[PDB]
């Protein structure tokens, strides 16, 4: 008798644990599949913010940005002309569903840039999503 | 009489041991199923740390890293441009739920690299999870 | 009626603060309960997903995904 | 009794093989990088190199190759104008990190080519890292 | 008495068969590697090879094949343009570790092909290691 | 403590030369060991990646990727 | 005595059920292919079809549709250029194996679109498979 009752317990428990793992797989879907992103619209600008012979060079970066997601998202890093930059101060946060010109200050992480007035630089902005966007910035002076 | 009482003992003991193994299978679930990971955000950088004509070449590696798990996790190895590297000194540990720029020093495990200034190398960082992340590092000089 | 006996979040032990929530026979419903870390200090990140295994008075454990909101 | 004891063995073995397969998927990643190590720079040349009245037509392929990888890589095959060619003698190799004019002898494997002086032929060169690279070759006579 | 004695035999046999099956699952793994040994490099050629007025159309398939495996491997079948072809005479083989132009005769198994001079046909070549490889073949006439 | 007992690389069996390394309980290490082909000989290409299976004293094996350095 | 007979029946039945599950897994495969029964081919046309200044703008959706499935399949819904649209009449249906022109009347589900002559609009037509096919409609009216 024993072998058949144990086989039946393990069939029933197998159904239970398999369905639990299937329900878990359906439960992952919302977290992994949020659509929409920070979109970067048109060209941005880099401007020299550095003043009074300060030891660190600071740049304004202004760009039009559209959050198509349902949560507020912030910039976390920018890379410009291959070089990494740090955001100075608090990074801007872009509200859900909204289009804005954001402006933020940046400093080169290491080395220093060679921006030419009126030249256009490819940049990548990285957001709190881990998502990044390629952008074009024109250096104003 | 004997055969039936023994059959009943083995039915009861079968139920007991089957349920014990089913409860054990439910008890495995937390250990095998921790979600979240070290996420590597944007490009990192490699910089020459080697000084004073030292016998071993050392490189800075800086990268933005986000721990989405609930425990502190550390780097354990990096492979860059196919070549293995050892972490020099104590490897950095990334706190739970936190985004940081980590920096760590590395030396080639065997042979020597041929990094070109401004070139981008695919790298894989391996964490204490056994999980690895593909990354892009730009060599700064 | 069946109650939550314990919870483990992302491998870590956690304690239900209050009295345990209990779900009546045949019901499907939202269930809400207060919980505290049993040891150390976790730090959840907004919009990230964490597994919880909730253990019920059957001895049954169900894995679930929780998305952090706070 | 037997069924529960068997299920316990297969549960624990399942965890071990599943984790080993996940670790293998992370462990593959460094090997993928090397598929991109080579690139071919500029037009190469083809030259008729065989001695007068010899039974075999043998050409001479000179190309600049750049190796960005951490290991020496060799030419394994060439396809010119759609024809496969056999490589004669030892394959040439390009050292790790170097850029060099590379020269090798080839002989046609399908039919015979009818190269025209000053004509331009698209080749694909194949390298020991498992990589193909498009090339232009100019036949010199 | 009997039932307990029987249960003991089946418990111990259960442990032995379960362990043997787990060891077999670990023991399969080396065989999986060989499924990737071959790759086909560049365009091949098809040439009409049959004698004038012969009853059978017979073509000639020349391709560069690379064998990365530790054993000699042979061509077992080819599918060209969606048609299965029979391989005539002995199958060709490529030695362990080598890259070679490989040549073989084929004859169509379904209908007849109507190859057009200079036209490009996608084939799939099948190899004795149980592997298919996509190929492009150019019909020479 | 558990030791390596065999490796198979690119389908081919290899023997461990000398004493096989033993890995202590609960520990992470770079192990290094010497091997010879059991029969035939390999055709490793510099920078190429080979699937390997390491077998331990457990009878357990692990799939691995090895990159040939030269 | 019974324990061995039960073990034998469950061993034999285990072979039967495992083979049955393997056969069931294959039996799904021809079934799931029906998910792609429909192809929409060529450019379609959209034409004004309403009369006498009536309260509904109604349009002409003509497309060529190929059904590769073994059942007649119908248009369930249509989305034109991102906008929802309602089929006015009964749904058009294309028989098994047929390629044919299909024509149906459609109305905007919300708002008021305005198509321009000779301009191209995408439509995704959703069929009773749940399959969606993108198509280009050129406006005629
Ligand atoms: C980069 O953006 C900053 C805001 O994020 C902005 O700060 C504002 O500055 C204006 C006045 O700016 C003028 O004067 C400075 C010298 O002090 C020049 O560099 C600049 O070009 C303008 O001519 C001020 O009224 C405002 O309150 C500030 N707001 C904040 C939030 O700080 C910087 O001016 C800007 N930098 C540049 C170069 O445009
Ligand atoms: C980077 O961000 C800092 C905040 O995260 C910010 O600190 C604020 O500074 C302002 C005034 O800063 C002026 O003076 C300093 C010298 O003390 C210069 O380096 C700077 O360029 C400005 O000219 C101050 O009012 C405010 O209270 C500070 N806020 C905090 C939280 O400390 C830095 O100024 C900023 N760096 C630059 C170069 O703008
Ligand atoms: C790699 O990261 C190290 C920290 O993990 C960092 O050490 C710090 O070094 C700075 C000073 O660095 C300057 O000078 C060195 C030569 O001594 C240059 O190589 C470097 O580029 C800088 O110009 C020091 O103030 C700080 O206290 C150190 N901190 C620690 C924890 O050691 C290295 O400098 C860095 N390497 C490079 C090349 O950036
Ligand atoms: C990072 O810095 C190291 C220290 O300056 C340097 O190693 C020294 O290199 C020279 C010769 O190597 C040559 O080739 C490298 C190619 O990367 C050139 O960067 C370098 O200018 C030289 O032409 C060697 O004589 C000296 O002994 C080395 N010293 C040490 C500390 O080993 C590295 O070359 C440099 N770059 C890389 C990629 O590691
Ligand atoms: C790799 O990690 C070691 C620690 O794990 C570290 O040792 C420390 O070294 C610093 C000073 O090191 C300088 O001098 C040595 C020569 O003695 C050079 O090789 C080195 O590059 C530095 O220029 C010392 O203050 C500290 O006490 C040491 N810590 C310990 C725990 O021993 C090595 O320096 C490091 N290697 C490199 C190349 O940085
Ligand atoms: C953790 O669990 C306790 C029992 O499960 C619960 O006790 C209940 O407390 C409420 C009122 O609590 C208030 O006051 C206390 C101080 O006494 C604060 O710590 C608390 O934050 C509240 O402001 C009481 O009505 C009820 O009868 C208690 N239940 C029992 C069974 O005794 C605690 O409140 C709970 N912790 C928190 C923070 O809510
Ligand atoms: C997290 O859960 C807490 C209890 O598990 C809860 O505090 C209790 O709050 C209620 C207030 O009733 C509201 O609860 C939440 C919002 O507060 C709503 O989902 C719900 O529909 C009600 O509007 C209070 O009556 C009660 O005394 C508190 N404690 C206990 C022991 O019940 C928090 O409100 C909740 N927070 C969030 C953000 O969900
Ligand atoms: C395949 O072409 C190669 C490219 O020319 C060639 O190897 C190169 O040799 C040349 C120099 O050749 C001249 O000089 C040697 C004397 O040094 C004489 O033997 C010969 O008659 C030549 O006129 C060199 O410049 C070049 O760099 C070498 N190869 C490379 C790396 O580009 C081979 O000789 C030739 N082989 C055949 C059979 O044609
Ligand atoms: C490479 O050079 C060879 C001589 O070094 C040359 O062989 C001579 O060929 C000529 C005639 O050449 C024509 O005809 C052949 C077929 O016979 C064609 O393959 C070729 O393309 C020309 O159309 C012959 O008279 C002579 O006896 C041969 N030998 C010598 C010493 O001159 C090869 O033809 C030549 N190949 C190419 C592609 O240029
Ligand atoms: C199928 O095509 C094969 C590729 O050409 C061919 O085998 C190859 O033979 C050629 C050399 O053929 C010429 O030279 C021989 C004299 O050596 C004459 O018999 C013949 O008439 C030729 O013009 C060789 O270059 C090539 O490398 C060989 N195969 C390979 C590995 O590519 C077969 O002859 C051919 N068979 C049929 C029936 O068409
Ligand atoms: C491969 O070569 C054969 C001759 O070596 C050739 O046979 C000759 O075919 C021609 C006419 O060819 C056309 O018609 C046949 C059917 O009769 C088609 O299969 C073919 O594709 C052409 O459309 C015939 O006049 C002649 O008598 C045959 N024999 C000789 C000696 O010329 C095959 O047709 C040829 N196959 C291909 C695919 O090119
Ligand atoms: C089902 O298709 C089969 C594949 O074509 C076919 O058997 C094959 O026969 C062909 C040769 O057929 C031609 O030649 C014979 C003369 O030898 C004529 O009888 C006929 O009219 C043809 O045009 C052969 O190449 C092929 O290898 C055979 N089958 C295989 C193993 O692929 C059958 O004839 C066909 N049956 C029906 C009823 O359609
Ligand atoms: C395989 O393992 C053997 C031990 O199990 C080891 O024997 C030791 O050998 C070393 C020195 O070996 C060198 O010389 C021999 C020729 O005699 C070469 O085959 C070898 O490659 C080395 O170059 C010796 O000091 C030590 O005492 C030996 N130990 C024992 C226990 O005998 C073999 O050397 C090793 N095989 C290889 C190829 O390394
Ligand atoms: C690892 O090193 C071994 C010693 O140098 C070498 O074996 C020697 O190889 C040569 C000829 O083998 C040739 O083919 C291999 C292909 O891997 C080439 O690496 C090598 O350069 C040669 O072209 C042989 O004459 C000599 O007797 C061998 N000596 C020994 C110790 O057996 C291996 O070839 C090399 N690579 C591999 C994959 O094992
Ligand atoms: C929208 O869909 C209706 C059903 O899918 C369709 O109803 C059919 O109508 C025809 C005759 O319709 C005429 O008369 C009506 C007034 O009753 C006018 O609105 C219309 O424009 C025509 O002039 C009838 O023969 C048929 O049996 C009906 N079908 C069903 C299933 O009831 C409407 O005609 C259609 N709208 C338009 C504008 O064609
Ligand atoms: C837009 O589609 C309308 C139906 O989807 C259609 O009205 C129906 O018109 C037919 C008349 O038959 C002709 O349909 C068009 C031209 O009118 C031709 O493509 C076709 O070959 C026939 O000559 C009428 O019988 C029917 O009752 C109407 N309604 C229904 C429910 O069928 C429009 O004619 C059509 N307009 C255009 C410009 O394509």
Residue numbers in the entry:
A (entry chain d), B (entry chain a), D (entry chain b), E (entry chain Y), G (entry chain c): 16 to 156
C (entry chain W), F (entry chain X): 87 to 156
Paper text:
While some archaea produce only one type of filament, the archaeal model species Sulfolobus acidocaldarius generates four. These include rotary swimming propellers analogous to bacterial flagella (archaella), pili for twitching motility (Aap), adhesive fibres (threads), and filaments facilitating homologous recombination upon UV stress (UV pili). Here, we use cryo-electron microscopy to describe the structure of the S. acidocaldarius archaellum at 2.0 Å resolution, and update the structures of the thread and the Aap pilus at 2.7 Å and 2.6 Å resolution, respectively. We define distinct N-glycan patterns in the three filaments and identify a putative O-glycosylation site in the thread.
A deletion mutant MW039 (Δagl3), lacking the sulfoquinovose synthase Agl3 generates a trisaccharide N-glycan, missing the sulfoquinovose, one mannose and one glucose molecule. To tackle the long-standing question of how glycans impact on the architecture of motile filaments, we solved the structures of archaella and Aap and from the glycan truncation mutant Δagl3 at global resolutions of 2.4 Å and 2.6 Å, respectively, and discuss our findings in the context with previous motility experiments. Next, we purified archaella and Aap from this mutant and solved their structures by cryoEM. In the maps of the mutant archaellum and Aap, the glycans were clearly altered. The densities for the sulfoqiunovose, the terminal glucose and one mannose were missing. However, comparing the protein structures of the archaella and Aap with and without glycan truncation revealed no significant differences. These findings demonstrate that the motility-reducing effect of the glycan truncation is not due to structural changes in the archaella or Aap. Interestingly however, only the O4-linked α-mannose was missing from the N-glycan trees of the Δagl3 filaments, while the O6-linked α-mannose was still present. This suggests that the addition of the O4-linked α-mannose occurs downstream and is sensitive to the addition of sulfoquinovose. Through solving the structures of archaella and Aap from the Δagl3 mutant, we show that the structure of the filaments remains unaltered, despite the ablation of three terminal sugars, which includes the negatively charged 6-sulfoquinovose.
